[PDB]
DNA sequence: CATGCGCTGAC
DNA sequence: TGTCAGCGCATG
């Protein structure tokens, strides 16, 4: 009827320390409903009594090349970018439909589909296969199309540029992402100091303390999160994620206003 | 740079 | 016969 947190901590702990070849010191456990640590610099994990997880911190998975190189080019197509935000797979907001993103066909949506999504679904599996079996599974169980669309077990990734000072983004306005039908995963890249650019969970009182080549992996449609502002250097971060919509409404394999053309004459 | 089409939870 | 802001996406 209650799960011990000693049990469960040692054996996520186990699991991916196998998986990601790495060990994780100062790792800490807490439920859901319980005292959230204010401060996260190390591996952490939140669950609910069934001891499934709901939040799961792992410090510095990516290899150093790797971030470094991925920001590089990030930093490179965004400066020819006017849009602070960027969306490639499909998307279903504001329609009764999932439709290809307008990024998808752009410089960024085809590096992050064709270069990176590939490289970080990897990451993504070894994630998943750790904390969140059922998230996986339920990935897997979605159409063809959106897994060769994106290259992702996720439909959809969100490329978030955030600049010092920039209040207007929409992650530095506290929110949640309610269209979730799953938790997402995500992945930190870019240049910024560790007391900044911290994802808090305003309602648990809790900071997680985010770095280039970081994973985070939680549910945005539960808990209540906004985005700290950085004074120097530059926030660049991949949320992969899945709206309901991609489970529920149909898919014309088309932009929004050409799915939508389509949609009517479907009748 | 404001408006139209269109969805949806949070209130 | 509830209102409305907001991970889209244009058009002028
Ligand atoms: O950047 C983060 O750490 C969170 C971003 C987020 O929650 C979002 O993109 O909706
Ligand atoms: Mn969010």
């Not at 998307?91 to 085809?110: I, K, R």
């Not at 064709?114 to 969140?132: A, D, F, G």
């Not at 997402?184 to 900071?207: I, M, R």
């Amino acid at each position: 009827h209650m799960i011990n947190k000693k049990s469960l901590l040692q054996n996520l702990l186990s699991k991916c320390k196998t998986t990601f070849q790495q060990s994780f010191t100062n790792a800490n456990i807490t439920l859901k409903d319980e005292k959230w640590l204010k401060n996260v610099r190390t591996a952490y994990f939140v669950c609910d009594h069934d001891g499934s997880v709901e939040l799961a911190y792992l410090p510095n998975v990516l290899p150093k090349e790797l971030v470094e190189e991925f920001t590089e080019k990030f930093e490179s197509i965004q400066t020819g970018r006017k849009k602070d935000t960027g969306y490639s797979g499909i998307l279903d907001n504001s329609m009764p439909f999932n439709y290809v993103t307008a990024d998808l066909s752009q410089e960024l949506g085809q590096y992050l589909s064709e270069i990176v999504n590939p490289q970080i679904n990897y990451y993504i599996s070894k994630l998943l296969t750790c904390v969140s079996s059922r998230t996986i599974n339920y990935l897997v169980s979605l159409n063809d199309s959106y897994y060769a669309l994106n290259n992702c077990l996720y439909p959809s990734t969100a490329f978030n540029s955030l600049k010092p000072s920039n209040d207007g983004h929409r992650i530095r306005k506290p929110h949640k992402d309610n269209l979730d039908i799953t938790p997402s995963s995500l992945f930190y890249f870019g240049n910024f100091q560790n007391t900044e650019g911290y994802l808090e969970l305003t309602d648990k009182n809790c900071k997680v303390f985010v770095q280039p080549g970081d994973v985070l992996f939680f549910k945005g449609n539960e808990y209540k999160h906004v985005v700290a502002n950085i004074t120097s250097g530059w926030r660049i971060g991949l949320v992969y994620f899945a709206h309901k919509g991609s489970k529920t409404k149909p898919y014309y394999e088309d932009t929004q206003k050409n799915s939508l053309k389509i949609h009517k004459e479907t009748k």
